[PDB]
Structures are given as structure tokens and as C-alpha cells.
Design an enzyme around this catalytic site. Structure first.
Site, short mmCIF file in Angstrom:
data_model
loop_
_atom_site.label_atom_id
_atom_site.label_comp_id
_atom_site.label_asym_id
_atom_site.label_seq_id
_atom_site.Cartn_x
_atom_site.Cartn_y
_atom_site.Cartn_z
N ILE A 5 15.34 4.08 3.14
CA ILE A 5 14.04 4.04 3.86
C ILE A 5 13.47 5.45 3.86
O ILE A 5 14.22 6.40 4.11
CB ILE A 5 14.14 3.44 5.27
CG1 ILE A 5 12.76 3.05 5.79
CG2 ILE A 5 14.86 4.38 6.23
CD1 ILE A 5 12.77 1.76 6.58
N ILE A 6 12.20 5.56 3.53
CA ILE A 6 11.43 6.82 3.58
C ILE A 6 10.31 6.60 4.60
O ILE A 6 9.57 5.61 4.46
CB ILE A 6 10.89 7.24 2.20
CG1 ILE A 6 11.95 7.23 1.10
CG2 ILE A 6 10.24 8.60 2.31
CD1 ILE A 6 12.12 5.92 0.39
N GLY A 12 -1.03 13.32 12.55
CA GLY A 12 -0.83 14.75 12.25
C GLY A 12 -0.34 14.95 10.82
O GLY A 12 0.43 15.91 10.58
N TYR A 77 6.50 -0.69 -7.48
CA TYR A 77 5.37 -1.49 -6.95
C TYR A 77 5.79 -2.23 -5.68
O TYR A 77 6.99 -2.56 -5.47
CB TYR A 77 4.85 -2.45 -8.00
CG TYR A 77 3.38 -2.75 -7.88
CD1 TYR A 77 2.43 -1.88 -8.40
CD2 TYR A 77 2.94 -3.92 -7.29
CE1 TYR A 77 1.08 -2.16 -8.31
CE2 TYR A 77 1.59 -4.21 -7.20
CZ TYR A 77 0.66 -3.33 -7.71
OH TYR A 77 -0.67 -3.63 -7.65
N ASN A 119 -0.89 -7.99 -8.07
CA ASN A 119 -1.71 -7.32 -9.12
C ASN A 119 -3.12 -7.00 -8.58
O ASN A 119 -3.69 -7.76 -7.77
CB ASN A 119 -1.77 -8.19 -10.38
CG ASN A 119 -2.36 -9.55 -10.10
OD1 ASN A 119 -1.66 -10.46 -9.65
ND2 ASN A 119 -3.65 -9.67 -10.31
N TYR A 120 -3.69 -5.88 -9.01
CA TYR A 120 -5.02 -5.41 -8.56
C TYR A 120 -6.12 -6.44 -8.86
O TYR A 120 -7.04 -6.53 -8.03
CB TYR A 120 -5.41 -4.12 -9.26
CG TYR A 120 -4.64 -2.90 -8.82
CD1 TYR A 120 -4.52 -2.57 -7.48
CD2 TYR A 120 -4.08 -2.07 -9.75
CE1 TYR A 120 -3.82 -1.45 -7.08
CE2 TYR A 120 -3.41 -0.93 -9.37
CZ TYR A 120 -3.28 -0.61 -8.03
OH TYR A 120 -2.59 0.51 -7.67
N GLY A 139 -7.46 8.49 6.57
CA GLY A 139 -8.21 7.54 7.41
C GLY A 139 -8.07 6.10 6.91
O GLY A 139 -7.66 5.21 7.66
N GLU A 174 1.17 4.44 -6.85
CA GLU A 174 0.47 5.11 -7.96
C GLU A 174 0.65 6.63 -7.82
O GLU A 174 0.81 7.29 -8.85
CB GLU A 174 -1.01 4.72 -8.03
CG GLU A 174 -1.25 3.23 -8.21
CD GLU A 174 -0.90 2.61 -9.55
OE1 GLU A 174 -0.23 3.30 -10.36
OE2 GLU A 174 -1.27 1.44 -9.80
N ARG A 177 4.01 7.34 -9.20
CA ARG A 177 4.04 7.18 -10.69
C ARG A 177 3.38 8.36 -11.38
O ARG A 177 3.76 8.65 -12.54
CB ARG A 177 3.33 5.90 -11.12
CG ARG A 177 4.05 4.62 -10.76
CD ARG A 177 3.07 3.47 -10.90
NE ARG A 177 3.69 2.18 -10.83
CZ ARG A 177 3.06 1.03 -11.08
NH1 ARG A 177 1.78 1.00 -11.41
NH2 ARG A 177 3.72 -0.11 -11.00
#
Ligand SMILES: Cc1cc(C)c(-c2ccc(C(=O)O)s2)c(C)c1
Length: 260
Positions: A5-6, A12, A77, A119-120, A139, A174, A177
């Protein structure tokens, strides 16, 4: 099952905290063992133990809402996410991936699978907007985290959910990548300036699989066909070789074994 986990928070957020986050993500995606023309190759899907298949990105915002995105280490992804007592998954492409995602968020009380993939093309249709019309920055990420969190009680409509996935995928997957895309996000965070990705970013995202193939199949570094990419101003240029990509691309999807 526990996966690495990251953590990242928009609260802040600085250029350095975002950079430390993306470096941690790349670190966990790659073994380091496979490198072609100085560019790391993600693990081969074939034969990959399920315990090594995913990493988790926990995202928190100023509202102290948290969502956990699951990333597939084979392509960096997003495959789904957890918000409190619910987990949501993109429709898997194949039965092997359908089986693989049963190992994510195994303790969550409610599991949902969407009819749509991540997928986009599909996410843009649900959002009612292309990536070139969706602003990115700290934001937009703050807003996307809230949107993902409040889907769990229907406080979020599907187009806003889809737009939120488009923001998260670009600013995490992205950026992991491509150093170029990490740089584009760092510039937004440094100067507090939300903006949609320019054509240089969109065409890199579009080309990632093709660039991965072209680099790995390359005649000792040189491509069979020219890949077309765009400048920031939208003008088209051709890429014939790996040298121009080493500054730009950080990770590649496994295509084939190294050449003889
Ligand atoms: C492979 C590759 C190589 C280069 C030089 C770029 C650009 C970096 C700045 C550009 C501009 O100012 O228009 S274009 C991209 C987007 C990809």
C-alpha cells in the site's frame, strides 16, 4: 490477502509529496530485473503469483475521506477501488482477470462489478467528456476522492464517478508510466494551476502499449514503423528509435522476451 500500500493525501500536498508518492508507486510496480534500453518492463502476466499481482494506492483528501485504488502490476492500471464497506471493480476483460480480482478487498462487506471496463473510451462516454476537457491537479484529485467515496451511498452520479476515474488514472497510473506526465502533474501542483492535459500527454497515454511493443521488438533500438505523437501545440511528429523515449517513458508493459 495483503498487498503493498502506498499512501497519498491532497491535504497539504507539495511537489515533493506527489513526487515521493509516484516514485513509491513505480518502485512497487517493478522488480527491476527486466530493463530494455534502460527502461524497466513490468512483470509478465503469464505465471505471475496472485500474491504479487496488485498494489494498493490509498488516497485521502482535506475532508479526511479515504479510498483505496487497486493497480494491476502488469500494466500499472486501476482495476477497482474500495470506499469503506464497498468495493467496485471494472468489468474484467477475461476469466483469468475475473478470477484474479476475487483476491482484492476479500474482507469488504459489499463487492460490485461494473458492466463497463476502465478503458478511457468507455470512461469518457460515461463522463460525457474527453480527457482534453477534464482538468487535472490537486483540486480535481481532491474532488475525485470525494466523488469515489460518496458513490458508496449513491451521493455520486455515474458521469461524475467516470470523470473521477479519468482524473485518478492519469494522475497515478499515467504519471507512474511516464516521467513526462509526472512532470506535467508536478508543474500543476507547484503553481496551483488546474488544467486539462495537452495533446502531448493524451497521445503518450494513447501510445503506451504501442511504444512498449515498438521498444521491445526494436532492431537493437530502432523501430520497424514510426509511432506518431503530438507536441503541446498539437502538431504531429514521428518517433523512429528508443533514444528519444528514455527521458519520457518510465515503465513498459511486457510484450516479448529480450531479442537474441
Ligand atoms: C517521445 C517524446 C519526445 C519529446 C521531445 C516530447 C515533447 C516535449 C516538449 C514538447 C513541446 O514543447 O511541444 S514535445 C514528447 C511529448 C514525447
Amino acid at each position: 490477502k495483503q498487498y503493498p500500500i502506498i499512501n497519498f493525501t491532497t491535504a497539504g500536498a507539495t511537489v515533493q509529496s506527489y513526487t515521493n508518492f509516484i516514485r513509491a508507486v513505480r518502485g512497487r510496480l517493478t522488480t527491476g530485473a527486466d530493463v530494455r534500453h534502460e527502461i524497466p518492463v513490468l512483470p509478465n502476466r503469464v505465471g505471475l503469483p496472485i500474491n504479487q499481482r496488485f498494489i494498493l494506492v490509498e488516497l485521502s483528501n482535506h475532508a479526511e475521506l479515504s479510498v483505496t485504488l487497486a493497480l494491476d502490476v502488469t500494466n500499472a492500471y486501476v482495476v477497482g477501488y474500495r470506499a469503506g464497506n464497498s468495493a467496485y471493480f471494472f468489468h474484467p476483460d477475461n476469466q483469468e482477470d475475473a478470477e484474479a480480482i476475487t483476491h482484492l478487498f476479500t474482507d469488504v462487506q459489499n463487492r460490485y462489478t461494473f458492466a463497463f471496463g476502465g478503458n478511457y473510451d468507455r470512461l469518457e462516454q460515461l463522463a460525457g467528456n474527453l480527457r482534453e476537457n477534464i482538468e487535472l491537479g490537486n483540486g480535481p484529485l481532491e474532488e475525485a476522492i470525494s466523488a469515489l467515496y460518496y458513490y458508496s451511498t449513491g451521493g455520486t452520479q455515474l458521469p461524475t464517478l467516470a470523470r473521477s476515474f479519468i482524473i485518478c488514472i492519469q494522475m497515478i497510473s499515467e504519471a507512474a508510466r511516464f516521467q513526462y506526465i509526472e512532470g506535467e502533474m508536478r508543474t500543476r501542483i507547484r503553481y496551483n494551476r488546474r488544467s486539462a492535459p495537452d495533446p502531448s500527454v493524451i497521445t503518450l497515454e494513447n501510445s503506451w502499449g504501442r511504444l512498449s511493443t515498438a521498444i521491445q521488438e526494436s532492431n537493437q533500438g530502432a523501430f520497424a514503423s514510426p509511432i506518431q505523437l503530438q507536441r503541446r501545440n498539437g502538431s504531429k511528429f514521428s518517433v523512429y528509435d528508443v533514444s528519444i523515449l528514455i527521458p519520457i517513458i518510465a515503465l513498459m508493459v511486457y510484450r516479448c522476451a529480450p531479442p537474441p
